[PDB]
């Protein structure tokens, strides 16, 4: 690779790596919020599912939940 | 849950969700850098592996690579 | 690696690879059952979740579901 | 769901679950082979990578490896 290409490549890697640091920082801050939640007596596993489903299409989730319950009852789950 | 707990919970979710937005922003910026890389004629799949292995312990990676080559040759790969 | 070790290594790889073939065969049969399910008018995505949760500890799942609902209501989801 | 549908559904779940048992059995046998490998002085992590790459397109893997090395040298890795 020529001098120009080498320069570009170095810049690309440097820039991604700087952004990966920022991403790591934000992940640590998210951890810290859950750590505070745990210390205030909340269930972190459940909190994480709250955040997770609050990103899903709520109609689709409730639709799928209804079909799930229908199937569970049809196979005779008690 | 009482009023206090409700307040805490809302704050927790709000704060995580704000951080998830920031994380999404940073992921988009990482995509954009690779998009620029692609437009300058680089191999994005390979770039991503450069970044990935540049986070690993390089002694361990080279050690494992050596043992790999040893095993491949022992089973007669050509 | 000496002759003995080479023999062992070849046997190891051969045996794992034969088992991976069997695993692939079983995965294909699982796909086929869901294909039959789809052709009989069932919702395969939901079927897959039925199988998935039918492997979980049902007390823990229902416990977590209860706490989830409690949190969702506390943050005022409607 | 009517009687017919209930019957079909039960059959579907039963059949998938029987296949998941077989899959579990095969996974355990794969573990056992690696356990034997470990007891004969082999590096299981490396063995697993041997099996993994022996499923990839070897031209594509070597092509990507070459481009990788080219990029690593261009950014001045030592």
Author numbering:
A (entry chain A), B (entry chain A), C (entry chain A), D (entry chain A): 12 to 89
The publication says:
GapR is an essential NAP in Caulobacter crescentus involved in DNA replication, chromosome segregation and cell division. In this paper we present three crystal structures of GapR from C. crescentus, crystallised in the presence of double-stranded DNA with a sequence from the origin of chromosome replication. In all three structures, GapR adopts the same overall tetramer ring form as seen by Guo et al., albeit with small but important increases in the diameter of the central channel. DNA could not be visualized in any of our three structures, but DNA could be detected in gel electrophoresis, indicating that DNA is present in the crystals.
The best diffracting crystals were of full-length GapR plus DNA. A diffraction dataset was collected which included reflections to 1.85 Å resolution and was of the space group I4132. One of these models gave a possible solution, with residues 35–65 well placed in the electron density maps generated by Phaser9. In this structure, there is a single GapR monomer in the asymmetric unit. It has an extended N-terminal α helix followed by two shorter α helices. The three helices are relatively open and not bundled together, suggesting that this conformation would not be stabilized in the absence of a binding partner. Indeed, applying crystallographic symmetry assembles the monomers into repeating tetramer units which have a large central channel.
